[PDB]
Design a protein around this nucleic acid. Structure first.
Ligand SMILES: [Mg+2]
Ligand SMILES: [Mg+2]
Length: 225
DNA sequence: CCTGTGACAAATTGCCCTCAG
DNA sequence: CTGAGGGCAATTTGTCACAGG
């Protein structure tokens, strides 16, 4: 099969939020949201084990330590903003991470994010973790999550996304407001990298209005077709 | 206006090595 | 032996000048 990798289940509000995290931060953010789904009333305290992280992401003990230490530092000052319109901004962490023993980090998610993570019925995105552990460009990650929000059961879909919305929720660098660059350094990159490192296969077409290009119409099928 | 491309810069990659318990 | 450190060269991301439809 391919069903042994953990099932990531995030609310569509998180899928659509505007924030900025590295690949490495997003890698961890998948793990945290997994822990949180164990509540009979959860508090926002998560733990991270170097040794297991290495096995999941195919990295050496030493380099897995570099990756974790450096991102935990980079969280501070980083906000996530939720919409639906609507406008709300929260901090990811409320305390610095730390290590009570070798190999172990304790992080403290803002408890208020707990409902935005768990979400509402028939209103959520889902994907296996194995589906996304070989992506490098975090932007390629954000797009894949989005596509997954519209995946039918047979692993196929069609969705049109407006470009001014991608620049906003995915918080793209300034210069990609000039379409030639948006084309070259974001769209063609994140599409090839999905085609290569995920079980999804993707094509696209550009919706133009006047001289301006305004929407990307993404459609895809699953490799097991 | 729109487009693509060449050049330059600043950032991320996997990889190497030392050293402490 | 693991993992907390320091470091590096090659490749990928981000910016912007110039040329043409
Ligand atoms: Mg990054
Ligand atoms: Mg790394």
């Amino acid at each position: 099969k391919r069903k042994n990798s953990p099932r990531i289940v995030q609310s569509n509000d998180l899928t659509e939020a505007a924030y900025s995290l590295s690949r490495d931060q997003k890698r961890m953010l998948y793990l945290f949201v997994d822990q949180i789904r164990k509540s009979d009333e959860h508090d926002g305290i998560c733990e991270i084990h170097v040794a297991k992280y290495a096995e999941i992401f195919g990295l050496t003990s030493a380099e897995a330590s570099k990756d974790i230490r450096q991102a935990l530092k980079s969280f501070a000052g980083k906000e996530v903003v939720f919409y639906r319109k609507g406008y709300e901004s929260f901090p990811w962490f409320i305390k610095p991470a730390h290590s009570p023993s070798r190999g172990l980090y304790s992080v403290h998610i803002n408890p208020y994010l707990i409902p935005f993570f768990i979400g509402l019925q028939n209103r959520f995105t889902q994907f296996r973790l194995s589906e996304t552990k070989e992506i490098t460009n975090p932007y390629a990650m954000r797009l894949y999550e989005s596509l997954c929000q519209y995946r039918k059961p047979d692993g196929s879909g069609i969705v049109s996304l407006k470009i001014d919305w991608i620049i906003e929720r995915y918080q793209l660098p300034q210069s990609y407001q000039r379409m030639p660059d948006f084309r070259r350094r974001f769209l063609q990159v994140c599409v090839n990298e999905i085609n290569s490192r995920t079980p999804m296969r993707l094509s696209y077409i550009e919706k133009k209005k006047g001289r301006q290009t305004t929407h990307i119409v993404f459609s895809f099928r699953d490799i097991t077709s």
